[PDB]
Design a protein around this ligand. Structure first.
Ligand SMILES: Nc1ncnc2c1ncn2[C@@H]1O[C@H](CSCC[C@H](N)C(=O)O)[C@@H](O)[C@H]1O
Ligand SMILES: CCCCCCCCCCCCCCCC(=O)O
Length: 192
């Protein structure tokens, strides 16, 4: 109930959410790049979310600035998020482990890149995104603030929406038919 509390909660899930990536990422950044794509652009699109995921909500916690925009939400609906975010971080570490040396945020195609249909990736390509999709939906409700809610959602949806079709096109360049088959056998976010 205490508001100062939820902040302490989130800044943890976050702190750990970040830890999960900081671990798996530096591991796959030690693998050299082959072809990148419009990276000077994606970088910004990312950094755009970087506001949405981190810079922005960090300041719904460590600062009172955004206070007037928060949603005055009942504790019931907030916990519902806190649960799901938990499940998320699992899924994250699931996904993120399933991916490993292939991951980047910029559309890299890595030197030894191997296409993975096998993991949480069977029946879902871009699970990670679907994760992120949730991530932004949840953290707004958890933090119960409209800006942190509304903004974050947008900045992703965009990056998402203009991101994915190049990504798919890109993977098709490299893997050719193996990817077209894949998409037939998979959905983008939910399965089937
Ligand atoms: N199905 C796949 N198998 C292996 N690498 C993939 C992949 N889909 C995307 N990638 C790589 O992953 C990087 C983006 S990370 C995003 C991965 C996936 N879209 C997800 O959200 O779960 C891109 O550089 C792309 O080269
Ligand atoms: C470091 C924190 C994690 C932020 C990931 C968000 C950036 C989008 C990447 C896809």
């Amino acid at each position: 109930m205490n508001e100062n509390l939820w902040k302490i909660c989130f800044i943890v899930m976050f702190i750990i959410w970040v830890f999960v990536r900081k671990v798996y990422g530096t591991r796959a950044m030690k693998n050299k790049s082959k072809k990148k794509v419009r990276p000077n652009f994606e970088k910004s699109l990312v950094f755009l979310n970087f506001i949405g995921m981190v810079f922005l909500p960090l300041t719904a916690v460590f600062s009172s600035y955004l206070d007037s925009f928060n949603i005055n939400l009942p504790d019931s609906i907030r916990l519902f998020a806190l649960i799901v975010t938990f499940l998320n971080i699992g899924l994250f570490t699931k996904i993120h482990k399933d991916l490993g040396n292939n991951w980047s945020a910029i559309l890299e195609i890595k030197d030894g890149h191997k296409l993975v249909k096998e993991g949480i990736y069977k029946n879902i390509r871009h699970p990670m995104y679907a994760h992120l999709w949730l991530w932004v939906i949840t953290q707004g409700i958890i933090l119960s603030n409209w800006v942190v809610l509304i903004f974050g959602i947008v900045a992703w949806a965009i990056l998402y929406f203009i991101r994915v079709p190049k990504e798919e096109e890109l993977l098709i360049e490299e893997f050719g038919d193996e990817y077209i088959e894949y998409m037939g056998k998979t959905g983008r976010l939910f399965p089937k």
